[PDB]
Amino acid sequence: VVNGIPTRTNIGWMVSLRYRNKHICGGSLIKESWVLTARQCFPSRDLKDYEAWLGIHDVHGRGDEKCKQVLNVSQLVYGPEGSDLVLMKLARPAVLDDFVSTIDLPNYGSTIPEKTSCSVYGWGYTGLINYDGLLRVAHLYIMGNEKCSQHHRGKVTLNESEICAGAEKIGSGPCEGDYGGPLVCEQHKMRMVLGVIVPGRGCAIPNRPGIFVRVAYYAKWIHKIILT
Amino acid sequence: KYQLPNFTAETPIQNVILHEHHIFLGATNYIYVLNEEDLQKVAEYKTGPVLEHPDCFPCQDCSSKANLSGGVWKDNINMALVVDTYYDDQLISCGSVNRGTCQRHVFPHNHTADIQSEVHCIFSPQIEEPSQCPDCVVSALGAKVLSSVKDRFINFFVGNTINSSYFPDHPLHSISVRRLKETKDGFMFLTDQSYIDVLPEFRDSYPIKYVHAFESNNFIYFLTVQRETLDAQTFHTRIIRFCSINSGLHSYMEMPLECILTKEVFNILQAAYVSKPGAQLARQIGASLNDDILFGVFAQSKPDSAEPMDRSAMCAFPIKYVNDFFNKINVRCLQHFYGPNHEHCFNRDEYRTEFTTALQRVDLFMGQFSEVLLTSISTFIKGDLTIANLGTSEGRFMQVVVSRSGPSTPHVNFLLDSHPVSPEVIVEHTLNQNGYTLVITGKKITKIPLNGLGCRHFQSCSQCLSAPPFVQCGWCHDKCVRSEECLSGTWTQQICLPA
């Protein structure tokens, strides 16, 4: 993540997806056997090549022998044609200690008020000479799409299935290696995954918000896949 | 002798792009910027002569070795030129020279002729698999590059003629698909299935010219000239088709194409444009007002060779039928990529299929052009009519009507600069069905209007009223032209006053 800071400790819903042994993508653990993530995360079709590490803080697991959980991937369920969502089934549930937790999800129709504060999380690119490998977090506020369209200056027009968050006046935000990661907000009381990181039109461009995928738009579908 | 918007550069023009009312020529050692409106040069950028060296690496430059122990000074032929607009608007250009290594010119947020102020070379150093070189895009000895946005990534599909200059750690690939990084500082190949390469053994035997590429209907297509079979004497044009995906080249198949006189075959494709048909042509060839057709200007081989004789014929393939021929239920295996022997080939995403028979179609000109070498084609609709824009090795440019029923003769025919006509061409429409073609000749680009022209050569009222009706000329007091292009309140197709 460009222009964010190290997370104090590790984060429960955070999943690193690994293709052919190196990390490639983020993922939100939404139920014991399901990681919600982006489609741009699967170069292979052969699920042998992948592996999902859970309850880590160091992208390479360096701090975290006492928390790490590595799981093979058993299923890929791609979401509707429009979306870049895909639901990953892991071959055996994650076991939920304090280091591994699921994130909540929105109700199907729900909105979010503007300037609702949020975070993106990731082990993707930080433009640093030597990234120490720890999870990074960048804070954004939710922008409306209507303004978000005008900030991107006519280049993009957002579907009711896309959602925006930016930081005021500066460049920060997710990037290569961050995708599939959660944009997480909170309002009601607790924490919900509200957008899913997908590739942008440039990382941390000063004063141009990030567009994420509205999970709310897809919650029905997600539930009918994960609830069982 | 016509009088047209006439820009001349100091070096030969390889390639041409029209973007936001400017024209970008990709030239030997140069990129130019002309104004769309009058073709005046607004800006240059010097990709200028460059120095080759074993020690001098591909994105770092050197007058820090100019004195040379075994290093040569080299001409920087433009091989590719892509405007990208998904990211912040940028010109991406790919030269022949530093192992085929593209740079991006980023337009400032108002001056569009500014190829100059912010330019980054694109070569990220290779660390996971130090064997690969995904920033080595283009081949000095023939490339076609087609870029398209897909899955929020900019994707580059790339045909490259390849010659067994075993380059340690910077090889090239015959076809391949790689995406940019959102960090804009490097291309990446998604998996090892994302390129298909001529086998090291045949890398010389003989090669694969890439004439044209285009995306349509969710496949990528390449047009190609190569080896009816390996070490097999005679040459040949194929289509190559594969699924439009980042993840790799998927449903790959090359199928031969045949143009014939009516068998008198034109086995060397020279140029090609892809467009929709007009009703007249539509009706005739299998139709669909809104269908993509591949117009291909072909040529006859000098026996046992790949070089073309001065014999031409053009003929048109609707891609809808191309697909049928690809899909329907026979099929060989990719002799130049697999062995002729070993598994997969003795068997039947995964497999790579050659076809044993061509899709043939007949000359649409019926030999009208069987004594000249057509080197460039382009196509447009006027009402019901479909019109070819043709170009020739002798320098002749000419507008013809395309038809089976009717052996039509060109209504425009004349000399552009003595240097041959280039297959690289631009057509751009404007409201109400006119527009222009940009046409490269040696080192000159000319802005030939699609429409008014076939009138301008009538030197007298009478003669003008006598022109072929479809061209729709009239007499405007002293000149001959179509109504929109006529100044005063007079204009006829019927009356000549006592002059």
Curated annotation (Swiss-Prot), chain A:
Q: Domain of life here?
A: Eukaryota
Glycosylation: residue positions = 72, 159
Domain named Peptidase S1: residues: 1-227
Disulfide bond entries: 25-41, 118-185, 148-164, 175-203
What is the recorded name of this protein?
Hepatocyte growth factor beta chain
Native species of this protein?
Homo sapiens (Human)
Which gene carries the instructions for this protein? HGF
Curated annotation (Swiss-Prot), chain B:
- Where can this protein be found? Membrane
PTM comment: the record says: Dephosphorylated by PTPN1 and PTPN2.
Which residues are reported to be glycosylated? 6, 67, 110, 163, 347
Q: List the disulfide bonds.
A: 56-62, 59-121, 94-102, 133-136, 259-315, 333-345, 455-473, 461-496, 464-480, 476-486
Tissue expression summary: Expressed in normal hepatocytes as well as in epithelial cells lining the stomach, the small and the large intestine. Found also in basal keratinocytes of esophagus and skin. High levels are found in liver, gastrointestinal tract, thyroid and kidney. Also present in the brain. Expressed in metaphyseal bone (at protein level).
All residue ranges annotated as the Sema domain in the record: 1-450
Q: How does it assemble?
A: Heterodimer made of an alpha chain (50 kDa) and a beta chain (145 kDa) which are disulfide linked. Binds PLXNB1. Interacts when phosphorylated with downstream effectors including STAT3, PIK3R1, SRC, PCLG1, GRB2 and GAB1. Interacts with SPSB1, SPSB2 and SPSB4. Interacts with INPP5D/SHIP1. Interacts with RANBP9 and RANBP10, as well as SPSB1, SPSB2, SPSB3 and SPSB4. SPSB1 binding occurs in the presence and in the absence of HGF, however HGF treatment has a positive effect on this interaction. (Microbial infection) Interacts via extracytoplasmic residues 25-656 with L.monocytogenes InlB; MET can bind HGF, its endogenous ligand, and InlB simultaneously. InlB probably dimerizes upon binding to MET, which encourages subsequent dimerization of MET.
Q: What does this protein do?
A: Receptor tyrosine kinase that transduces signals from the extracellular matrix into the cytoplasm by binding to hepatocyte growth factor/HGF ligand. Regulates many physiological processes including proliferation, scattering, morphogenesis and survival. Ligand binding at the cell surface induces autophosphorylation of MET on its intracellular domain that provides docking sites for downstream signaling molecules. Following activation by ligand, interacts with the PI3-kinase subunit PIK3R1, PLCG1, SRC, GRB2, STAT3 or the adapter GAB1.
UniProt note: domains: The kinase domain is involved in SPSB1 binding. The beta-propeller Sema domain mediates binding to HGF.
Q: Which family does it belong to?
A: Belongs to the protein kinase superfamily. Tyr protein kinase family.
- Noted disease: Activation of MET after rearrangement with the TPR gene produces an oncogenic protein. Defects in MET may be associated with gastric cancer.
- Protein's recorded name: Hepatocyte growth factor receptor
Q: Which organism is it from?
A: Homo sapiens
